[PDB]
Amino acid sequence: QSEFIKDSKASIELRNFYFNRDFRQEGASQSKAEEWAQGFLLRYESGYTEGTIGFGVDAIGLLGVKLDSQDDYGEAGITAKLRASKSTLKIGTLTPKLPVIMPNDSRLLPQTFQGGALNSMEIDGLTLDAGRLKKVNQRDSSDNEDMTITGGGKRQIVVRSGLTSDKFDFAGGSYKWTDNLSTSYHYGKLDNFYKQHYLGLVHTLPIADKQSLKSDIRWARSTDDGSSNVDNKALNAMFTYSLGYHAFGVGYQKMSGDTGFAYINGADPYLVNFIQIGDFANKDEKSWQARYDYNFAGVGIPGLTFMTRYVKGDNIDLLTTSGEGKEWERDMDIAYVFQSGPLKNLGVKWRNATMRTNYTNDYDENRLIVSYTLPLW
């Protein structure tokens, strides 16, 4: 009980989420949206009881309330935790972080899942996972529901009418060959929707200090599971050369097969050119990204960061008409974290995006996220 209490943590987060969206047609505004919401996030994580098999429990209290634009939404979640040696089993509310499932947390409240998961690190450098998710609790929702696949746009994903799934199975692993090179292999199956094999290779190469080249290479094969037409290969890689407080990144992404990339509806796709508005994951879509980061600590104003990126996509199959679909997006992020004063740790982040296409709706979008986390101890 010494670790249980001592490793235990609790916190309350205040979270303010604002966004506006302007649909552009010609050089004019066709329509606008605005959402404003306040969040209260209560988190608790126990440590583990002593012994061969340790037990712990996590609890989550998420409350969202629309400020303007059911008014109240959110969820309460409990998770039982078991740990033997270096293997941990979790049952209940899960938020896995894997190439085959990246839960959304870009709005007010996180997307969460119900199920059971196993993470294992018994062997030096080897990390294994496996699990089953049964239900998803979307970010704007109040309870748990069957999962579906991300559809729409020109993804050209087609599914049996009314189809839903209460089984997403996953298993995988990753191995650190050196402290600079790891590879990963991950499997995910959304029952009746798709099967997916994800391969990864991450290489960080220090030229000197402080200079580094990170190579992030990825490849996923997705295939149908009886009741969809899913058929996709996704090659996507990012190269990020870091020097001092600058980082310059280049990304490449290519869809092929009869549909775009397959991923749980509501989640984020693990793709290098997935950005603020577009995922550039339509049928046949190829896209290139250029990204620049600067961290103002490099001078005066620690806690202030800048980021901008540009992504250009083409070769999109328009599906019902001939011709090449093209789209492009530019993002600009500015983020500040108070380093001192009574406001310390208060976080504020502005995310700005422009999306333009030659075939569908264009819009601009601004997000302001204000965040403050207070430990209860």
Author numbering: -1 to 67, 87 to 394
Task: Copy text verbatim from the article accompanying this structure deposition.
The transport data demonstrate that Occ channels have a pronounced preference for substrates with a carboxyl group, due to the universal presence of a basic ladder on one side of the barrel wall.
To determine if the phylogenetic subdivision of Occ proteins exists at the structural level, we determined X-ray crystal structures for seven Occ family members (OccD2, OccD3, and OccK2–K6). A comparison of the crystal structures suggests that the division into the OccD and OccK subfamilies occurs on a structural level as well; the OccD subfamily members of which structures were determined have much smaller pores than those of the OccK subfamily. These data are consistent with the fairly large pores observed in the six crystal structures of members of this subfamily.
